[PDB]
Structure formats: structure tokens, C-alpha cells
Amino acid sequence: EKGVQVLLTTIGAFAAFGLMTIAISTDYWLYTRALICNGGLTHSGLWRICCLEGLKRGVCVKINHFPEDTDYDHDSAEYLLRVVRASSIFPILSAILLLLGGVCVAASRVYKSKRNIILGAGILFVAAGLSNIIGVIVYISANAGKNHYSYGWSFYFGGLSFILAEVIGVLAVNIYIERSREAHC
Amino acid sequence: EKGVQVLLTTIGAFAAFGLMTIAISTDYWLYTRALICNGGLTHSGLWRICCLEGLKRGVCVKINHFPEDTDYDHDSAEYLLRVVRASSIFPILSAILLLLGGVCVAASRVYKSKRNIILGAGILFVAAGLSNIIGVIVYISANAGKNHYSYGWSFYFGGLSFILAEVIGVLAVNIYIERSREAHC
Amino acid sequence: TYIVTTILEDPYVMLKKNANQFEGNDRYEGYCVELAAEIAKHVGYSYRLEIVSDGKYGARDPDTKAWNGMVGELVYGRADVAVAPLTITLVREEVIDFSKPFMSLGISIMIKKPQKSKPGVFSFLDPLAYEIWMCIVFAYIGVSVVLFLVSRFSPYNEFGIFNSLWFSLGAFMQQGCDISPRSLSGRIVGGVWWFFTLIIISSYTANLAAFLTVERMVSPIESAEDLAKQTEIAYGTLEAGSTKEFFRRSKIAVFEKMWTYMKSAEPSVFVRTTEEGMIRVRKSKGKYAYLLESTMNEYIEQRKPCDTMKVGGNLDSKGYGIATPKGSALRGPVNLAVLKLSEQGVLDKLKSKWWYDKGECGDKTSALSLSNVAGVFYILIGGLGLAMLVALIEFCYKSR
Amino acid sequence: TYIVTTILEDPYVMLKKNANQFEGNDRYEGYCVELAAEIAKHVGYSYRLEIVSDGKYGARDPDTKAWNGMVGELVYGRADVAVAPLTITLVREEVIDFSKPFMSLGISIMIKKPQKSKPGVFSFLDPLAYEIWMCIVFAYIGVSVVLFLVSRFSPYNEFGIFNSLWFSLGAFMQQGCDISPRSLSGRIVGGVWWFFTLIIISSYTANLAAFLTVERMVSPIESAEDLAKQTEIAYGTLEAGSTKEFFRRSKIAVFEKMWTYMKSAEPSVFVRTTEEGMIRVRKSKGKYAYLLESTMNEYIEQRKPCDTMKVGGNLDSKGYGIATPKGSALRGPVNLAVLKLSEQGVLDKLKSKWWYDKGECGDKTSALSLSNVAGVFYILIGGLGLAMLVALIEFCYKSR
Amino acid sequence: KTVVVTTILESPYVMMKKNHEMLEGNERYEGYCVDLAAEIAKHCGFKYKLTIVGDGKYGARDADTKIWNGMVGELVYGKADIAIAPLTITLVREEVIDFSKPFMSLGISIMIKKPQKSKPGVFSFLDPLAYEIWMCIVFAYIGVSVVLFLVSRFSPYEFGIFNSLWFSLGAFMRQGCDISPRSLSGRIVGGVWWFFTLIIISSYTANLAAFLTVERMVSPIESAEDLSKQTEIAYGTLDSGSTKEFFRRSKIAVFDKMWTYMRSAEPSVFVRTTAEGVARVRKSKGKYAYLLESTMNEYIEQRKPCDTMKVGGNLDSKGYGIATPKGSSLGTPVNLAVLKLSEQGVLDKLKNKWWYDKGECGAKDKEKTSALSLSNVAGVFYILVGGLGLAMLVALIEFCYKSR
Amino acid sequence: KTVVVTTILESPYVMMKKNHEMLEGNERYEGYCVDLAAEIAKHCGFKYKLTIVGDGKYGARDADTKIWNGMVGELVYGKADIAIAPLTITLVREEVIDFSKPFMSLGISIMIKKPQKSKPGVFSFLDPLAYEIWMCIVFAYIGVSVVLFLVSRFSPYEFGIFNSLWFSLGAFMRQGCDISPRSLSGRIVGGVWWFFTLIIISSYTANLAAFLTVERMVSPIESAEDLSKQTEIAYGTLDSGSTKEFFRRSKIAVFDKMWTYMRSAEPSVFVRTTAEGVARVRKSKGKYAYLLESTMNEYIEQRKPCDTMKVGGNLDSKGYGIATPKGSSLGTPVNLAVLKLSEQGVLDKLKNKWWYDKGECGAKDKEKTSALSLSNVAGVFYILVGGLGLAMLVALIEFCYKSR
Ligand SMILES: CCCCCC/C=C/CCCCCCCC(=O)O
Ligand SMILES: N[C@@H](CCC(=O)O)C(=O)O
Ligand SMILES: N[C@@H](CCC(=O)O)C(=O)O
Ligand SMILES: N[C@@H](CCC(=O)O)C(=O)O
Ligand SMILES: N[C@@H](CCC(=O)O)C(=O)O
């Protein structure tokens, strides 16, 4: 229950990180009709859009996250959104925090002295979760700015990533409370 | 506090009854323009409508609570409303209960043996209250079935009647709880 | 033998079960085929059923003063008789004479009005987009976990992961709160979640109000005037027919306006054949309406699936009479037949039988129906099911 | 001396401070009076200002081919000149010649659009009638007292009259519950009060939605087409004037429709005098609109209280020119003056000064403004006041 | 000889002028039919005199007597040479009197008074949700309470049947309850019930918003078939008229039933005159509806007070033609006049001005919403006072039980 | 001699036909002005030849050169006998070229692209209540908490500043709070705050319902004065045209400022052709607006894609008359033709068919509402995640403080 928890945390932490890294790298985030190739069924991703059954088949082009718009500046809402969409800093931050948590959960094993070792691991995992939610929101909002769009498997990985990221966060909290209760009394 | 309460109850019970009886008898319930006398400013009452500054001045006619309507029967919603409006059984019931409470509060003085004497007095007073509210509702609903209408002083007596009727009901409850606590222990 | 020109349009003329197997008159089975047989018996005159090459009710060329289809075949004299649903028009009466009408007619409007679309289970979720619902779920998980962490962040606070999940679910529904955050860090989480809940619930309520308002203020077309006024609806009539000519010559202001629009409508609203008109209506889902004689509207309603219905009533009195070349010898006998066969009632019975036997189909509250909110009831019953199942799991666990 | 016929209509002609004290030309002070003086100086021709008996811009009698008012006085030759805002019409040009126009004109629409009505404090209570509010108060007293009685009906229940009043007030607001009825008799009271609260709150919300929707979907008149389409608005024009004649002869379909309606409008929309038109607009509160030359619309807007404004822009180009009998000797000099005085800029400056000096008055969000919900804030601050006052009363009582 | 014209006085076909008493000759009657008669007179080159039939019923033939009355009666007797009155072209009439090609054709319509949104009933507050939803909410409420009770007693973490009923009732009204499910199995029940309550309350609020925004008033008889089935509104036709005859001879079962019933109705639903029919409708407030030709329905709607309206598709199309005695000399010229005037479109223009251009109504059609009056929400107050009554009654029952 | 007509190609006055290349003569151009020219030709009894000025700008005079170009330039040189192009009647033009009475008069209008309801912003959820209400709600919230605190500490029946702040925040969100005021003085504060919260929440819900029901889109420049003040949208006129000249010579301060600015703008807001102006508007998406005669605005709106609209009252009325060389022989016949055609109303009928009857738009005008997209409510999610962030940050601050 206590020892298995720590194993599940670590096992899950890498699985969550794995899903996020697969998601970020994969180009199957959204299936939609795109003018790119000749109203074409396209598997668009977080980073690159790959067309299917259009002008080409399997062709992958880097997406333009800054087209010719009405609101463009250094400080504009329309711009600042697209900046964050293009950068995908939130999806990435999630993975960095998941990895850094994956370090901190490992560090908690060797350094039982520091109860605050696992505390951090959890805090990171929850934050990684929050980051993911922003990441999903910024993405959906940017995609919007009726053509049918269906979220592909890559997105749902990022969805599943969050669910895990939250869960390992819960476990991390439980472990901290256990280790603190061991130090207590 | 305890003895004064009983005096306030009795004093109030007759005042509440008085307001209700004045209200029922008075013909100043509603000031409105009526076709009766020649779009005329009229002080209509619960029972009789008296015209002013029209064909006549001071003329009082018994109101027709059953005009030529679309829904008329032995059992119809439109009818059953008008029946209750015309009868004004609820305004009257209030006064009967207020009076019967006025008896029961008097009976509570001579028969201290029966704690249930005042209990009844209160129950009656609250019921008299409820009756009043139906009485106000049925009246307003029936009047409706934009010509300006303003509720005259007679109505507000019936309004003030309820407020008292409730209050004497509260006092009656307090007295019962006091007398029961005296019997208790 | 008299060659009879007749358009193939059900129920007046329908192709028999096997087009290969049936030949001559036996090829076609229709009310007009039955009526032609009755005329043939009464007048003692042999008839040959054919379909005109042009396959049009009729046309007027102003330059040439020439008719087309059934009218054209009678004008040229190539077809000896027309036993067909051809409206008796002033323009037609001058070129080819008409017998007394067998049946009354009117210009009517055919639209797919009775779509009778099922609301569908999980239509209660329609006012908020699927992504909002999914983000609400993420937000719900996010808040609970964050509330749990902040409550347990500093060692000794009654908020376990399960109690935090409950508090959050309680706050979003707004129905209840078992417990309330005491910590500043906690109260911030709750405070902001409470704000999120208020705006989303209010958003949902509002937008659901928008949906139910706009679907209560839409008026289905009730009049020809209504049809003309609406730009979004495209009423269409057969490219070549008596109705198309009537609208062109129509002296009525509302009708002249409606006719003018047809010329100035893109894509062109005129349809070559009846079936093409019917398909155009079904594909448009009422974005395009069809103008045709009330008789054919009646049959389309009777025939499954009753997709197209009638709007208002017939615009104007029309009649279909037997058409022959002006001063033909055949005209006199067919005119007398139109009276004898009508009084016989055989003609009337044939029309009654054809519509009634074919007929497959033979009541509005604005109040929300059980179907509109059905999904919520299904979820409730499903939840009660799952709850019982989980109760038995807890009961079994408690024993061991 | 040339007798000049001029209508008394501000700002062109306004009566001087003391009508008794001022006589002849000094009696009238206006832009047209100033303009007449300038014409008199330039042409070196003595002028006498009078007001025509008829007091009409002009009329056409088809039977007699006779004009009335200023036009009539020039046609008969009784009045030697017309220095007035008389529009140069084709019909007028044939009977009496016109000089080059001093100022441009257009047919405009005058309505009391800027009413700018204050919502008022205690407008938040508008969606529910006063009787409902008063009955809610009675119901609130009724429920609390009944809850108190049922709780204390049988001797030993934490519901005192004050706690019952609190519970009831808590339930109606839906914000909180200190305590909850445990007795069957109690739970019935609460149960039914809870139902009452849900329906009234929901009623209030709904009806307030209705009010704010209907006052967001009402479009103020933006075009002449809009005016013609709306039946409820009655646009009116002067009984006798160039604009009234223009609308009668107007070849434009929308204008012919608008003109036809004026004849078929009850009560009659035509008004004898400008002031009568202005008063009719103010009494109608926009149920009646006024059609007049854009110049006079401009002055009514400039003049306090700016009740009437302009809708869209001017329908059509018009001009006011000096009117003389066709081939009068006076015509030639006044035509040359209309150019000399325009180039001088004195005429233009007089028009600018008259409008600007008179002028008293010189921005829409659908969002609810503080004013709309002001009453609720006043009640809040009043409550906090009363609360503090009651707190001090409790503090003083606690000491003794 | 001057041609005597038998024209019935029915606006807008024939209207008596304001000063028709002062006026003499054909001047007294001004109408579409008067204009049409003048046009016929010009093409025929025959002087015409406007006259009104005493009865004013265009056709009346007793089956026993077999003698026509009204316009038909004046042609049969030969006293009137010509009829510009809009006589319906019927088979029975066609055999007795020669008929010109119809100047106008119109269907048999239904005239009913406009529906009233007045007098919102008690329990009008329950209108936004259908009765089956309300009944299912009650079933759902019982279902949830019982399931919450069972799970709580079978798998304890208390929730008695009465406490579970209270919790559920508390949750539906969005009122907080101090008791809360603690068990996972319990919290699922509560959780899903809470979801059900939020959507229904929100649905109710929304739909009630829809109703109060947009007023749609239900037509009492939407169609003729509906009218016959319900029998809620009595249906009447001109006591002596083509409409009364057509219904009698009608081969349709629903029409035969309607004819039998109208013939077998006391008091008589049959009316002497059009005007009598219109007044009967207004006095009945929709207890009586009127069957008349769509043309007169159209102008009756256009004329104030804009209350009587045309409902449903026309029962059948009927033409109106210039009527002459059988084999009349006038017949041929008038038939050619009708054809000439139809090609000219003069008839259509005359109809347009009289029928719609008059604009007595102006075809008037999101009026400022009214604050809810105590009537609209009266039911909820009645339920409240009833509940308080029942509560007190149950309190006294508990008090009496506690003593013994 | 055949009269050379200098007509600019601007629809609907002049449109090149589908097969105008195949066609020869005047057949290539079909327009209102072509129809009008034909009418003038018939009254004058003079053969006319349709021609287009090379420049296509009706007036161009350099102030230094003082030489006219376009239609004016063809009349000055005498190469074109007559101009059916709609030349504006201006004082400067009137002195150089003889002008017939205006066939049509139209005002100087503003053409802008239609406003877009797309891209709901973050904090769009706060739109139904004005910013001052939100700020006053915050003040009210602080007011209530502080007053509840003071009354609780001064007249005790606990409510600390932090607990009072929590109670108030709890009450505004309609979320139940375990702590409740017990004192009369306290319960008044809570009681009235509860009333405030119920009305505001209900107000917000209602008004948000209004917004989502009824879409009204704000015009970027509602009036010309507004446009000049904001400077948000650049305003442009025909580089060489009556509109550019009128603004320069305009004695109005706002107009002089607008003229100076347009003249002093880089890149040039002045456009070579009408079509160039229309395209510039569409590419700018309302960053650039167009000033042109209301007539061309009208037909540009009627032509697809129905995006460019007419905003505000016309800046001033301008007439368009048949233009001839100073003292031309053609001048008199054409002036009489304009007067004859105006009385006939032929001109008005021609304008009606071309301007509105074409119905390319059909003047299209409660479309089915769209489910709220995450964008519309995005702000509330951002606030939520921001709050959770801040909460965690404050939790760690409390954790660090607890250690030391
Ligand atoms: C204790 C804090 C309460 C704050 C009260 C806020 C409201 C005050 C009354 C506003 C009246 C409406 C007009 C005000 C004009 C304005 O500020 O725009
Ligand atoms: N059925 C009509 C044609 C109807 C139409 O044009 O759609 C005829 O007989 O000519
Ligand atoms: N001012 C106009 C009259 C306007 C009107 O008829 O209202 C004129 O000079 O005749
Ligand atoms: N005009 C009809 C009477 C009116 C009617 O019943 O419609 C007839 O000749 O019988
Ligand atoms: N027709 C104008 C040019 C177009 C305009 O600027 O409106 C002229 O003659 O100058």
C-alpha cells in the first residue's frame, strides 16, 4: 500500500511523461479539412500539419501560427494567444515538470532524510497538470481563432497525460503525508 | 414580559379583528376607472362599488362578480374563482377565526387548567392569517380577470390585519410554551 | 386507334412492375391509364398510350408562337388526343380546345415541413460545446487535486482527495457543501472555482434560453406572401408548365413579385421534371420549396415517406380537361364523356381508390417534451444503477 | 417699397421679444429677415416684411390650376417678392420663376429619438408586478410564523420566530441555511416554501430576460424604407408644402407607397403648421414622426430641449430661391444678388451664427449600466446603515 | 331596355356610400361589383340600373317547392336582366341560370375570432415543462430517495427513508441540506441527482424565458377535420346559400357529419346574413366559428376591428361568375366582357384596391413585455398556502398522537 | 455628325456585357447611363457613339497646370461632344463645362466592410454587466465584509475580517457557508447582501441571455465626426475627383482636418479607381474606410459579396447632370430631354431596375444560435487556472513561514 504507492508513482510519472512527449511530437492532434491541399482531409498536429487524400499524400508542412490578421503588434490579445499557441510552451512545460518530478520521486528514494523531496515531486506533478489544461485551452481557442473537426489520438494522449499527472500528484501527496506522519510522534 | 404578552395578545386580537371588520365593510378597497359611470374614478370595495365624479357622485351599487363570460359552469376554474371572490368567504373566515381566537385568549385567562386553551387561540390566529393571504390573492387575481388601479386604505387595513394576526399568533405560541414550561419540571 | 400523348408522372401514369415484360398500354399503370380506358369504352374509340418526346406539360415561344410537349403534339396534329393532367389555360384554349375538366386543380406549395426530427438523447449538452464540457471535467479534476494538495501541504484540514472531489462536484452543481475550506490557500481555490461555476451555469442557462427562444419565434411558411417575403426559401416551379406560364402572365402584385424573383434567383429555381423537384426539396431540407398542382402534392403526402406536405391552400382554381386540336371530330364525344363518366362515379371512385390505397400516413406544444431532456433521465437511472453496483462491491469488501 | 410675403417659422422668421413694442420689419427677427435686409442693401430696393394670410408654403388645386400662400400671392401679383425657405419645384418654376438657391435643402425625418429616459431606482423590481412583491412579503411572514408554530406545537426544535424568519429569508435568497427542519410538519412547510422560492426566482430571472431581449431587438428607424414598412409609426408632412407635393408626384415605388399610406392613415397625418407637427411628435412619444426640410430639423435639434432629431439623411436635393412672378423686372437683380451675396460670405456667416448661438446641445452599450441596477446598491448601503444602527442599539442594551 | 342588376349589399363588392341617402341612382352603391358592373355595361354598351334583391340570399330553393329565391329568383321571374352579385358557380345553379366565366375564384374558408392570451390559469407556472416531465420528475424523486436509502442501509459509511426523501427534495429545490451522503455508493446517487436537478431547473428557467419573450397563441380549430372531431366550436353557414347546399350534398363522411349536425343543431347555427354570422362569432368568443368564402373572410379581416381571421386551407375552390337568365341575350356580351377584362387585368387591379389597399387594419404585426401579474404565478401561492395548511393539520395530528 | 459620348465604366451606370468582346459598337456597354444616353439620343434625334476616357477619372485638374482631365478633358479638347457619365455638379466644373439639370442627385456616403462577431475575446464573459457595475460589486463586497466584521466585533451574539470576507464571497457565488450571522445587526447585513447577490446574478444571467439571443454588431465609425476623432480607420477619396476637391475647399474644421490628413497620409489613402477603393476596404478589414457617392455605395452593397455597407448620414447632397462643352449646340436639346424624361419618370424606373431589382444580395436579413465555443468562456478558465496557481504559491509561502 505505502511501498507499492511509491512504485506506482514512479511507473506512472514516466508513463505520463511518455504520453506528453508522444503527444507533443505526434502530428495527429486534429483531423480537419484544410485549404493547404486540394478542403482536404488533413491530420494536423501540435507542430506540423500532414495532408491526406489532397494534392499530395503524406506531405508534412510546418504550420503558420501567424497568418495575415487584423490584430497584430508586440502587445495584442490576438497576437499573444498565437505566440503561446505557436510556442506550445505549456504542453512543453508540462513535460519538463513531469520529468523534473520523475527526478524528484527518484531523489525521494535515495534521500529519505528530505521528506520535502517527494513534496516537490507532487507539487511539480499538479503544476504539470495545470500547465496541460492551459495547453489544451490555448490550443482549442487558437484553432477556433461549419467545417467538421475531430480531435485525433495525439490530443487524447495529452488528455490522458493530465489524468495521470493529477493521479501521480495525489499519490505524491499521500506519500508526503505518510513520510511526515512517520517523522511525526 | 409574560403577563403583558397576554394583555398585548388580547388588545391586538381585537385590533386585528377590528381592522378586518372595517376592511370587509368599507367600500374603499380599490380606486379605478369603471365603465359603470360616465371611465369614471370609482372607490370600489370588497362588497359595493361607489362611483365619484361620474354620472352620479356618492352612488353605491352592488358589484356584479358574475358578468357574461366565456367559461361558465357548476365546475369551472373561471367560475370557481369568481364564486370565492363574490362570496369573500376567506376575508370573512379570517374575521371569524380572529373573533374565535379572541374568545380562546379570554378563556385561557379564566381556565389556566387548559394550557391547550391558548394553543387553539394561536392556531386560530395563524390560520386567520393564512385565510387573509388567500383573501388578498383571490381578490387581486379576480380584479385582473392599461387602466390605472391604486389599492385604497381599506385593502391596507386587511394587509395590516394579517401582520397583527401573525404577531398575536407568535405571542399566543410564546404564551403556550411559557405555560407548558410552568407545567414542565 | 388514336395516339394519346401522356406525361409519365405518378399517380396519373406510373411504370408497371416489369417495364420489359409489359408492352403498349399494359406497360403503364395509373389513374390516367384507367381514365383513358374508361374514355375508350364510353366513346368506343381505340386508344394507344405513348409518352411525348418533349416530356413537358407545355411551353410558349413568343417569337415562333409555338407550343411544346403534349400541347405541341396536339398543335402539330401528330398526337390525336391528350388524356393527361393538363390545366385548361386561356393561352392553351386559343391553340387547342379543351373538354370539361375531369378533376379540379390548384397551384399549391410542397415543402419538407414534417421532418419531425428527434431531439436525441444528450441534446441537453447542446448549448455548451463539447470542448467546454471536456474542459469542465479537466477543471473539476484540477480544482479537487489542487484543493487536496493545499489542504495537506503543511503537516498538522478535513479535505481528502475524495472529500475535495465531493466539495468541487457539490460547488459546480451548487446543491450542497459538506465542508468549507478554512485555509487562505484553500479559500482561494474554492473562491475561484465558485466564480467558474457561477459563470458556466449562468452561460448554460442563458444559451439554452437562446436556443429555445429562436426555435419558438421561427414561423413555418403559412402563405404565398410569406414565401415571397423570405429570401432564404427558394420556391421553384417546373421549367415548362401551365403554372410557370400563369405566374409569368399573373396580374397580381404579390404573384408578379414572386415570378420576378424566380428569374433573378441563383441557382435557377426552375426544375425540368417532377422527380428532380422532389429530390431538390429533400436535399435542401426546406431551403428550396416546390410549386406544383395540389393533386400531385396530395399523392406525394399519401406516398411513403410523406416527406413533402402542403402549405396554406391552393392559390387559384384550375381544371384538367381532355385536349384535342380546335374543331377536331373527337372533341365533341370526349366533351360528352367528361359529363357521362363523371355522373357514373366510376372516374371519382378510381381517383379515391388510387390515393387511399397508396396512402401510408393518415399536435404542437412549446413545452419541453420528455425526449428533449431524455438524456438527463437516462444518466440518472444509469447513476442509480452504478451506485447500487458500487454499494454491493462495498458490502462484499466489508464482509472480507 | 416691395411687399415681401414670408411665413413666420423659426429660425428663418421669429417674433421679436415684444410683439406690441416692435412694428413693421423690427417686429420680426430671423435669418430670413437678416437675409432680406442684405438683399435690400445689395439691390438698393426698399422691402416691407409681412406674413401671408394663407400661411402655407404652397398648394396645387388640379381643378382651378391655382396656388396658395406665398406662391399664390406671387401668382396673383399682390406680393411683389418672396424671400422665404420655398423649395424650387418644377410645378412652382412653371407658374413663378426662382432665383439661384441661397441654401441647400433635403426632405428629412424628425422623431423624438433622443428621449434618453432614466431607468430609475427600483426598476430592478419591474419584471414582477407590485402585488407579487407584496404577496412574497406576506408569504415570507406566513411561512416563518407557520414554521415557528409547527416547531413549537408539541412540548419537548431549534426554530424560534427569529430563526424561522432567518431560515425563510435564507431559503428565498437561496444563499444559505443555518438549520434545517427535522419534523414532518416542519419539512412540509420548508418543502413547499422551497418550491415557491424556485418558481418565483426562476420567474423573475426569465421575465427579466424577456424585458432585456425585447429592448435589445427593437431597431430605431434608420431609413425611409424602415418608416414605410412600420405601420405603428405614423410619418406626417405639412398639409400644404413642396414636400407634400413632391411625395404626391414621386415616381419612386417606396415613396409612392409612403404617400399612399398618408391618404389611408387615421387620424390624418398631415399637420397645418410646423409647431402643431412638433407638439404631435412630443405627445406621440415617437408613435408619430414628422417629415420636414433638413434645415428646420437642424434648428429644432440645436434649440432646447433637442427633443426631435434626424433619421438617416436627407432623401433628395432641394434648394430655396427668391420667388418672383415669371418675367418680373425684380427677378434679374435678385438672381445676381443670390450669387454676389453668396460670394460675400455674409449670408453664410448669418446662417452659421443663427444656428450655433441658438444651439444648446452639441455612445451605446447593451451591457446593464449602474443606473439599471442602482436601486439594489442603494438598498445594500441602506441595509448596512440600518445594520450598524441596530449594532449600536445592541451595544447600548448590552451595557445596561 | 335598361338592364336591372340584382346585386346583394356585401362589402367590398357593394358598399352603401356615406351620403348614399342624398345620392340617387346607381350612385348610392360604391363597390368592386359596382366598378365591375360599370365595366360590363361599357363593353355591352347597355345602360344598367343597380338593384338589391329583397331576401339578399343569392340562392334559396326549398326542395319541396323547387323555386329559386334571391338573385336566382329575380332571374327566374325575369324582373332582373343581369346579376353582378358574386354568385357561386354550383351544378344546381348552372342548370337553372346561365353563368359567365368566373371574374374571381375563391375557396370555402373558416372565420374564427383571434385567440386571447388573457386569464393565465392556476398551475400556468407548470406550463414550460410538459406534464409527463413533471410526472417523471416525481418518479425520479421517489427513485433516487429509495435508492439512496437502500445503499445507505446495505453499505453503511444516517439516511432513513424519510431523511433520504428530505435530502432528495432539498437537492431538487437547490436548497442546501446539512445531511450529506458519505459513502461512495451514496455520493454517486447524490452526484447524479444533483446533475439531474441542475439541468431541469435550468431547462425550466430557460423555456419559461422563451414563453415570456415570444407570444404564440393556439388557434382553437387549426383545421376543418380538427373542428369536426372536437365539436368545441359550433360551425355555421348562410341559412340559404351555396355553402349550406354543398355541405348537404358533400360525399365526404366528415362533411356529411358536419352538415347533419348543423342541420340537427338547436339553436340554429345557420345565419340569415354575412353580418349576422360575423356578430354571432364576436358574441360567442369562439364558442361559434363561421364557414364562408375566403374573399369575404379576407375583407372582414382587413376591416376593423381586425379580430376575425382565416384559419386552415380552403375546403374547396368556388368561382363567381356574372349571372343571367337561362339563354339570356345579355349572356354572350357579358361572357366576352369577362374574357376581355381578364386579359386587361382590370378585374385583378379592382380587387387589389378594394381587398388590401383600403388598409383599415394595415396588416399590423416583439411588443414591450409585461411584468408578471399575480394571476400568472397564482398557482404557486395557492400551493404554498395549501402546504402550510396541510403542515399545521399534520402538526395537530402529531400533537394528538403524542398525548395518547 | 455622330456625337462621341465620354462614359466612364462604373456599374451599374456602365457595365461591359458577358460577350462584349464578340459585340461591336455601343452594344459592348450595357448600363443605366447607356439606357439614359439612348433616351437622350432619341429626344435629340442625334446618333451617339459610346466611348471611355483613357484616365477614367471624371475630373482631374492640377492647380499649377489648370488643365482638366477625364470626361472634362475630352469636352475641353472637344474630342467628345457629350458626356452621359454621372459627373458631380461642382462650382469649379460648372464654370468650365455646361451642365444639364441633374438626372439623379446623391449624397457623399461612407462605405465600410460589415462588422464581425468573430473571435470573442478573453474576459468576454464580463461583457453583459458594465465595467462600473463589476467595480462597484467589488466595492460593495469589501463594504459588506467590513460592516459585517465591525457589527460582529462591536455587538457580539466568530466573524473575523477574513471570515466575513469569506462569508460575503460565499454569498455572492450562491454557495452555502457553514458560518452564518447570529446577531440581528449581523443578519441584516447578510440579509441585504443576499438580496443584492440574487438580483445581480439574475441580472447577469438574463442580460447574457439577451446577448446570445440577439446579435447586434457595432459599426466601427457610426458617423463622419466619430471617424475623424478616432482616426482608427483611414478615410480615402478618388485621387482625382469632385469628392477630393470638395474636402480640400470644405470650410468645415473637421472636414479641413480630414482633407489635410488624407493629403498628408503615407501610404496614400487616395485611390485611382472606385474598384481600387472597394478592394482596399476588403484587404484592410475596416483599417481603411471609403468615402464615395451614395449611389455607388448602394449598388456595391447590392452586388455580391454584400460585405461593404453605407454608414451615417450623407456628408452633402451632389447632383449628376449630362455634361457638354461650354456653350455646346447639344446642350439645349439635352437639357430639354432631361426635363422631359424626369416628367415621364423613365429615369426613375431605369434607376429602380439597375439599383435594387438586380437583387444580387436580395437584401437578405433570428438565425439558429450556436453552442458556446471554448473561446467565448475562455477567460473564466484562465482565471480558474491563475487562481489555482496563486493558491499553490500562497500555500508554499505559508509552508515556508510555518518552518521558520
Ligand atoms: C459600499 C459600496 C457601495 C457602492 C455603491 C455604488 C453605487 C452607487 C450609486 C450609483 C448611482 C447611479 C449613477 C452613478 C453615476 C456613475 O458613477 O456612473
Ligand atoms: N401541372 C401543371 C404544371 C405545374 C408546374 O409548372 O409546376 C401543368 O399541368 O402544366
Ligand atoms: N419646407 C417645405 C415643406 C415641407 C413639408 O411639406 O413638410 C416647403 O418649402 O414647401
Ligand atoms: N353566393 C352564394 C351564397 C353565399 C355563400 O354561401 O357563400 C350563392 O349563390 O348561393
Ligand atoms: N464624378 C466625380 C468623380 C467621382 C467622385 O469623386 O465622387 C467628378 O466629376 O469629379
Residue numbers in the entry:
A (entry chain J), B (entry chain I): 16 to 53, 79 to 185, 196 to 235
C (entry chain A), D (entry chain C): 390 to 545, 565 to 770, 778 to 815
E (entry chain B), F (entry chain D): 393 to 549, 570 to 777, 781 to 819
From the manuscript:
AMPA-type glutamate receptors (AMPARs) mediate rapid signal transmission at excitatory synapses in the brain. Glutamate binding to the LBD triggers clamshell closure, which transmits to the transmembrane domain (TMD) to open the channel’s gate, or leads to desensitization through rupture of one or both LBD dimers. TARPs are principal AMPAR auxiliary subunits, comprised of three groups; Type-1a (γ2, γ3) and Type-1b TARPs (γ4, γ8) are widely expressed, generally slowing gating kinetics, increasing agonist potency and reducing channel rectification by polyamines. Here, electron cryo-microscopy structures of the GluA1/2 TARP-γ8 complex, in both open and desensitized states (at 3.5 Å), reveal state-selective engagement of the LBDs by the large TARP-γ8 loop (‘β1’), elucidating how this TARP stabilizes specific gating states.
Cryo-EM data processing indicated that not only open states (L-Glu+CTZ bound) but also desensitized receptors (L-Glu only) were present on the same EM grid, enabling a direct comparison of both states after classification and refinement procedures. The open-to-desensitized transition is accompanied by a large rotation of the GluA1 LBDs while GluA2 undergoes smaller, more local rearrangements (average residue movements of 24.5 ± 0.7° for GluA1 versus 14.7 ± 0.6° for GluA2). This is due to the GluA1 D1 lobe driving most of the D1 interface rupture upon desensitization in addition to closure of the D2 interface, leading to a rotation of the whole GluA1 LBDs. In the desensitized state, a predominant ‘elongated’ β1 conformation facilitates robust interaction with the GluA2 D1 lobe, proximal to Lys410. We hypothesize that the γ8 β1-D1 contact stabilizes the desensitized state, by slowing recovery out of this conformation. The conduction path of the desensitized receptor closely mirrors the resting state with the gate shut.
